[PDB]
Coordinates of C-alpha atoms and ligand atoms in Angstrom, one line a residue:
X3 CA -145.0 -20.0 27.0
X4 CA -142.7 -22.9 27.4
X5 CA -139.6 -21.0 28.4
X6 CA -141.9 -19.3 31.1
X7 CA -140.3 -16.0 29.9
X8 CA -142.1 -12.9 31.0
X9 CA -144.4 -10.9 28.8
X10 CA -142.3 -8.2 30.5
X11 CA -139.1 -8.7 28.5
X12 CA -140.5 -10.7 25.5
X13 CA -140.0 -7.6 23.2
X14 CA -136.4 -7.4 24.6
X15 CA -135.5 -11.0 23.8
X16 CA -137.2 -10.6 20.3
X17 CA -135.2 -7.5 19.6
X18 CA -131.9 -9.0 20.8
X19 CA -132.5 -12.0 18.6
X20 CA -132.7 -9.8 15.5
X21 CA -128.9 -10.1 15.5
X22 CA -129.2 -13.9 15.7
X23 CA -127.4 -14.2 12.4
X24 CA -124.6 -11.9 13.5
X25 CA -121.2 -12.3 15.1
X26 CA -122.1 -9.3 17.4
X27 CA -125.1 -10.9 18.9
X28 CA -125.0 -10.6 22.7
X29 CA -125.5 -14.0 24.3
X30 CA -125.4 -12.3 27.8
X31 CA -128.6 -10.3 27.3
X32 CA -130.2 -13.4 25.7
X33 CA -129.6 -15.3 28.9
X34 CA -131.1 -12.4 30.9
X35 CA -134.4 -12.5 29.1
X36 CA -134.6 -16.3 29.0
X37 CA -134.3 -16.8 32.8
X38 CA -130.9 -18.4 32.3
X39 CA -132.0 -20.7 29.5
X40 CA -129.7 -19.3 26.8
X41 CA -128.6 -22.6 25.3
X42 CA -132.2 -23.8 24.8
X43 CA -133.5 -20.3 23.7
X44 CA -130.7 -19.8 21.1
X45 CA -130.8 -23.4 19.8
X46 CA -134.5 -23.1 19.3
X47 CA -133.9 -19.7 17.6
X48 CA -131.2 -21.2 15.4
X49 CA -133.3 -24.2 14.4
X50 CA -136.3 -22.1 13.3
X51 CA -134.2 -19.7 11.3
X52 CA -132.6 -22.7 9.4
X53 CA -135.9 -24.6 9.4
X54 CA -134.1 -27.7 10.8
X55 CA -137.2 -28.7 12.8
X56 CA -139.3 -29.0 9.7
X57 CA -136.6 -30.6 7.5
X58 CA -135.9 -33.4 10.0
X59 CA -139.4 -33.6 11.5
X60 CA -138.2 -32.8 15.0
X61 CA -141.3 -31.6 16.7
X62 CA -141.1 -28.5 18.8
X63 CA -141.9 -30.4 22.0
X64 CA -139.2 -33.0 21.3
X65 CA -136.6 -30.4 20.6
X66 CA -137.4 -28.3 23.7
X67 CA -137.6 -31.3 26.0
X68 CA -134.2 -32.5 24.9
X69 CA -132.6 -29.1 24.9
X70 CA -133.9 -28.3 28.3
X71 CA -132.6 -31.6 29.6
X72 CA -129.2 -31.0 28.0
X73 CA -129.0 -27.5 29.4
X74 CA -129.7 -28.9 32.9
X75 CA -126.7 -31.2 32.5
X76 CA -124.4 -28.1 32.3
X77 CA -123.4 -26.7 35.8
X78 CA -124.5 -23.2 36.2
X79 CA -122.1 -22.9 39.2
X80 CA -119.0 -23.5 37.0
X81 CA -117.8 -20.0 36.1
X82 CA -117.1 -20.3 32.3
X83 CA -118.1 -23.8 31.2
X84 CA -121.8 -23.6 31.7
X85 CA -124.7 -23.4 29.3
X86 CA -124.0 -19.8 28.3
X87 CA -120.6 -20.9 26.8
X88 CA -122.4 -23.7 25.0
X89 CA -125.0 -21.3 23.8
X90 CA -122.3 -18.9 22.5
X91 CA -120.4 -21.7 20.6
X92 CA -123.6 -22.8 18.9
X93 CA -124.5 -19.3 17.8
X94 CA -121.0 -18.6 16.7
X95 CA -121.1 -21.9 14.7
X96 CA -124.5 -20.7 13.2
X97 CA -122.8 -17.6 12.0
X98 CA -119.7 -19.3 10.6
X99 CA -121.9 -21.8 8.7
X100 CA -123.4 -19.0 6.7
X101 CA -120.4 -17.0 5.5
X102 CA -120.6 -16.6 1.7
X103 CA -117.7 -19.0 1.0
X104 CA -119.4 -21.7 3.1
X105 CA -123.1 -21.3 2.9
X106 CA -124.1 -23.4 -0.1
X107 CA -121.5 -26.0 0.7
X108 CA -123.0 -28.0 3.7
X109 CA -125.9 -30.4 3.5
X110 CA -128.8 -29.9 6.0
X111 CA -127.5 -33.0 7.8
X112 CA -124.0 -31.7 8.1
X113 CA -125.4 -28.3 9.3
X114 CA -127.5 -30.2 11.9
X115 CA -124.4 -32.1 13.2
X116 CA -122.3 -29.0 13.5
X117 CA -124.8 -27.0 15.4
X118 CA -125.6 -30.0 17.6
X119 CA -122.0 -30.9 18.3
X120 CA -121.6 -27.2 19.3
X121 CA -124.6 -27.4 21.7
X122 CA -123.3 -30.6 23.5
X123 CA -119.5 -30.2 23.3
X124 CA -119.1 -29.2 27.0
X125 CA -122.1 -30.8 28.7
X126 CA -121.5 -31.9 32.3
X127 CA -118.1 -30.1 32.5
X128 CA -116.9 -30.3 36.1
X129 CA -114.9 -27.0 36.0
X130 CA -111.5 -28.7 35.6
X131 CA -109.1 -29.7 32.8
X132 CA -108.4 -33.1 31.4
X133 CA -105.1 -33.2 33.2
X134 CA -106.7 -32.4 36.6
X135 CA -108.9 -35.4 36.2
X136 CA -106.0 -37.6 35.1
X137 CA -103.9 -36.5 38.2
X138 CA -106.7 -37.3 40.6
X139 CA -107.5 -40.6 38.9
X140 CA -111.1 -39.7 38.6
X141 CA -113.5 -42.3 37.2
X142 CA -113.6 -40.5 33.9
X143 CA -109.9 -40.5 33.4
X144 CA -110.0 -44.3 34.0
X145 CA -113.1 -44.8 31.8
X146 CA -111.4 -43.1 28.8
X147 CA -107.7 -44.1 29.5
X148 CA -106.6 -40.5 30.0
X149 CA -107.2 -39.5 26.4
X150 CA -109.7 -36.8 25.4
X151 CA -111.2 -37.6 28.8
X152 CA -113.9 -34.9 29.0
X153 CA -114.5 -34.7 25.3
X154 CA -115.4 -38.4 25.4
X155 CA -117.7 -37.5 28.3
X156 CA -119.5 -34.7 26.6
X157 CA -120.3 -36.9 23.6
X158 CA -121.5 -39.8 25.7
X159 CA -123.7 -37.6 27.8
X160 CA -125.0 -35.7 24.8
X161 CA -126.1 -38.9 23.0
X162 CA -127.3 -40.7 26.2
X163 CA -129.9 -37.9 26.9
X164 CA -131.5 -38.6 23.6
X165 CA -133.1 -41.7 25.3
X166 CA -135.0 -39.8 28.0
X167 CA -138.7 -39.3 27.6
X168 CA -139.6 -37.6 24.3
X169 CA -136.0 -36.5 23.9
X170 CA -134.9 -38.3 20.7
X171 CA -134.5 -35.4 18.3
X172 CA -132.9 -37.8 15.7
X173 CA -135.8 -40.2 15.8
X174 CA -137.0 -39.4 12.3
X175 CA -133.7 -39.7 10.5
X176 CA -132.9 -42.8 8.4
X177 CA -130.4 -45.3 9.8
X178 CA -127.8 -43.8 7.4
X179 CA -128.3 -40.2 8.5
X180 CA -128.1 -41.1 12.1
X181 CA -124.7 -42.8 11.6
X182 CA -123.4 -40.1 9.3
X183 CA -124.5 -37.4 11.8
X184 CA -123.0 -39.5 14.7
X185 CA -119.5 -39.9 13.0
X186 CA -119.5 -36.2 12.4
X187 CA -120.5 -35.1 15.8
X188 CA -117.9 -37.5 17.4
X189 CA -115.2 -35.9 15.1
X190 CA -116.2 -32.4 15.9
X191 CA -116.3 -32.9 19.7
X192 CA -113.0 -34.8 19.9
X193 CA -111.6 -31.9 17.7
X194 CA -112.2 -29.5 20.7
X195 CA -109.5 -31.3 22.7
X196 CA -106.8 -28.6 22.9
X197 CA -104.0 -31.1 22.7
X198 CA -105.2 -31.6 19.1
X199 CA -105.0 -27.9 18.2
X200 CA -101.6 -28.0 16.4
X201 CA -102.6 -31.0 14.3
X202 CA -105.9 -29.4 13.6
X203 CA -104.3 -26.2 12.3
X204 CA -101.7 -28.1 10.3
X205 CA -104.5 -29.8 8.3
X206 CA -106.4 -26.5 7.9
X207 CA -103.3 -24.8 6.4
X208 CA -103.4 -27.6 3.9
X209 CA -107.1 -27.2 3.1
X210 CA -106.2 -23.6 2.4
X211 CA -103.1 -24.5 0.2
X212 CA -105.3 -26.3 -2.2
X213 CA -108.7 -24.6 -1.8
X214 CA -110.7 -24.1 -4.9
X215 CA -114.0 -22.3 -5.1
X216 CA -116.9 -22.3 -7.6
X217 CA -117.8 -19.4 -10.0
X218 CA -119.9 -18.2 -7.1
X219 CA -117.0 -18.1 -4.6
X220 CA -118.3 -21.2 -2.7
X221 CA -115.5 -23.4 -1.4
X222 CA -115.4 -26.9 -3.1
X223 CA -115.3 -29.9 -0.9
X224 CA -115.8 -33.1 -2.9
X225 CA -115.0 -35.8 -0.3
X226 CA -116.4 -36.4 3.2
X227 CA -112.8 -36.1 4.5
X228 CA -112.5 -32.4 3.5
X229 CA -115.8 -31.1 4.6
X230 CA -115.4 -32.8 8.0
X231 CA -112.0 -31.2 8.4
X232 CA -113.5 -27.8 7.7
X233 CA -116.4 -28.6 10.1
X234 CA -114.2 -29.7 12.9
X235 CA -112.0 -26.6 12.5
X236 CA -115.2 -24.5 12.3
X237 CA -116.3 -25.8 15.7
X238 CA -112.8 -25.4 17.2
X239 CA -112.7 -21.8 15.9
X240 CA -116.1 -21.2 17.4
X241 CA -114.9 -22.8 20.6
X242 CA -111.9 -20.4 20.5
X243 CA -114.0 -17.3 19.5
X244 CA -114.2 -15.3 22.7
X245 CA -111.4 -12.9 21.8
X246 CA -112.9 -12.2 18.3
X247 CA -116.0 -10.6 19.8
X248 CA -116.6 -6.8 20.7
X249 CA -114.1 -6.1 23.4
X250 CA -116.8 -5.6 26.0
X251 CA -117.9 -9.2 25.6
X252 CA -114.4 -10.6 25.4
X253 CA -113.8 -8.9 28.8
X254 CA -116.8 -10.7 30.3
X255 CA -115.6 -14.1 29.0
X256 CA -112.1 -13.5 30.3
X257 CA -113.4 -12.7 33.8
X258 CA -115.4 -16.0 33.8
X259 CA -112.6 -18.2 32.5
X260 CA -110.0 -16.8 34.8
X261 CA -112.4 -17.4 37.7
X262 CA -112.7 -21.0 36.6
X263 CA -108.9 -21.5 36.2
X264 CA -108.1 -20.0 39.6
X265 CA -110.8 -22.1 41.1
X266 CA -109.0 -25.1 39.6
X267 CA -105.9 -23.8 41.5
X268 CA -107.9 -23.7 44.8
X269 CA -109.0 -27.3 44.2
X270 CA -105.4 -28.3 43.5
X271 CA -104.4 -26.7 46.8
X272 CA -107.3 -28.2 48.9
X273 CA -106.4 -31.6 47.6
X274 CA -102.7 -31.2 48.2
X275 CA -102.3 -32.1 44.5
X276 CA -99.0 -32.9 42.7
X277 CA -96.7 -30.2 44.1
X278 CA -96.5 -27.6 41.4
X279 CA -98.6 -24.5 42.5
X280 CA -100.3 -22.5 39.8
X281 CA -100.0 -18.7 40.1
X282 CA -103.1 -17.1 41.8
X283 CA -105.1 -13.9 41.1
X284 CA -102.4 -11.7 42.8
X285 CA -99.2 -13.1 41.4
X286 CA -100.5 -14.0 37.9
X287 CA -100.9 -11.7 34.9
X288 CA -104.2 -12.2 33.1
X289 CA -103.1 -9.6 30.5
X290 CA -99.9 -11.4 29.7
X291 CA -101.8 -14.8 29.4
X292 CA -104.3 -13.4 27.0
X293 CA -101.7 -12.1 24.7
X294 CA -99.8 -15.3 25.0
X295 CA -102.9 -17.3 24.1
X296 CA -103.9 -15.0 21.2
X297 CA -100.3 -15.2 19.7
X298 CA -99.7 -18.9 20.4
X299 CA -103.2 -20.3 19.7
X300 CA -106.1 -18.1 18.7
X301 CA -104.6 -15.8 16.0
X302 CA -102.7 -18.5 14.2
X303 CA -106.0 -20.4 14.1
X304 CA -108.3 -17.4 12.9
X305 CA -105.8 -16.1 10.4
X306 CA -105.9 -19.5 8.7
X307 CA -109.7 -19.6 8.9
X308 CA -109.6 -16.2 7.3
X309 CA -107.6 -17.5 4.3
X310 CA -110.0 -20.3 3.8
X311 CA -112.9 -18.0 3.6
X312 CA -111.3 -14.7 2.2
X313 CA -112.6 -12.1 2.8
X314 CA -115.6 -13.3 4.9
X315 CA -113.7 -13.2 8.2
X316 CA -111.9 -9.8 8.0
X317 CA -114.0 -7.8 10.4
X318 CA -113.6 -10.8 12.8
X319 CA -109.8 -10.8 12.4
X320 CA -109.5 -7.0 12.7
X321 CA -111.3 -7.2 16.0
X322 CA -109.0 -10.0 17.3
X323 CA -105.9 -7.8 16.7
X324 CA -107.6 -4.8 18.2
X325 CA -108.4 -6.9 21.3
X326 CA -104.9 -8.4 21.5
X327 CA -103.6 -4.8 21.3
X328 CA -105.9 -3.8 24.1
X329 CA -104.9 -6.6 26.5
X330 CA -101.4 -5.7 25.4
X331 CA -101.6 -2.2 26.7
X332 CA -102.6 -3.4 30.2
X333 CA -99.6 -5.6 30.6
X334 CA -97.4 -4.4 33.6
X348 CA -95.7 -20.4 41.3
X349 CA -96.4 -21.4 37.7
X350 CA -98.4 -19.1 35.3
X351 CA -101.4 -19.6 33.2
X352 CA -99.6 -20.3 29.9
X353 CA -96.7 -22.1 31.6
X354 CA -99.3 -24.5 32.9
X355 CA -101.4 -24.8 29.6
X356 CA -98.2 -25.5 27.5
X357 CA -96.5 -27.8 30.0
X358 CA -99.5 -30.1 30.2
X359 CA -99.8 -30.3 26.4
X360 CA -97.2 -33.0 26.8
Ligands
QPC1 C1 -105.0 -25.9 31.0 C2 -105.9 -25.1 31.8 C3 -105.7 -23.6 31.5 C4 -105.6 -25.2 33.3 C5 -107.4 -25.5 31.7 N1 -107.9 -25.4 30.3 C6 -108.5 -26.5 29.7 O1 -108.9 -27.5 30.3 C7 -108.7 -26.3 28.2 C8 -109.1 -25.0 27.8 C9 -110.4 -24.4 28.0 C10 -110.6 -23.1 27.5 C11 -109.7 -22.4 26.9 N2 -109.9 -21.0 26.5 C12 -109.1 -19.9 26.9 N3 -107.9 -20.1 27.4 C13 -107.1 -19.1 27.7 C14 -105.8 -19.4 28.2 C15 -104.8 -18.4 28.3 C16 -103.5 -18.7 28.8 C17 -103.2 -20.0 29.3 C18 -104.2 -21.0 29.2 C19 -105.4 -20.7 28.7 N4 -107.5 -17.8 27.6 C20 -108.7 -17.6 27.1 C21 -109.6 -18.6 26.7 C22 -110.9 -18.3 26.1 N5 -111.4 -17.0 26.5 O2 -111.5 -19.0 25.4 C23 -108.4 -22.9 26.8 C24 -108.1 -24.2 27.2
CA2 CA1 -114.1 -28.3 26.0
ZN3 ZN1 -116.0 -25.2 24.9

């Protein structure tokens, strides 16, 4: 085949992909069977299942050449922010897009942008935060004036690659579709900037306050402004979904992300950065930080998402609580959350 995947575990990959439409899909096994091409394998899976290749005349070869390229622009050596995360966000977005409240709502084009924005939203992530880049006066921080530095990068890179040889997956869209898709993708990726979370949520609460559904229970969004607000929150939720998965998978994400944060602390030390030293693996509590994050950021977000789509998200939300309660139970420089909240200034 094209993924070079072995006849050995082709049944495995096929059987794992049966839960492609489910929140409890295991992206980790999928990466195993794909030879570490989860982003490409899942995206291809997603696009077939929604028939996006056919609808937009995106040939298989074009899609795969682009997706392979894009996946290569993610750093497998960065602990959390590699192609596996990207793959997980796209699959999570794929699931959200099809909940009963939501499924009839979005146009094929809108569906295309959301899943694509998901795929690209972290491409070429260096392993460090926006603030780290700012404080080191990296070329990126200067290029984007210290505002949504990386998110501006992920977009630029995601669209740039469309120009490589046989990589233009949007080649057969009209001029109007390409600019509609582009405005939407831009919106959704910039939406992933965490310093935008609170204003994201504020607006979502509003969507909920005045939500109306059809006779069928389908949410009603009559202007571009509304459905792009749902979309951008959808992708931010998906971005923030780790703790809503089966505890065993949430544990694997947490190991990865903590590795990546503490590795940012090592880089800050190596470089004699600022002065203010972040707590390390020994002095920090990962358990406290999780519960702080779930209470301060994740749950307030998911609870609101659950209102918008009542009761589509209940099993998701019941798992979040369970998971919070489980990190809770394990609870015994400048800490994880002290750092995340300070540099939200
Ligand atoms: C500010 C920073 C923490 C140094 C770097 N972070 C960034 O550049 C943005 C960023 C990237 C990913 C996440 N996701 C997550 N962030 C946390 C977290 C917990 C306590 C304090 C801070 C963070 N926990 C879990 C996830 C999870 N499992 O999804 C949150 C923020
Ligand atoms: Ca990001
Ligand atoms: Zn992300």
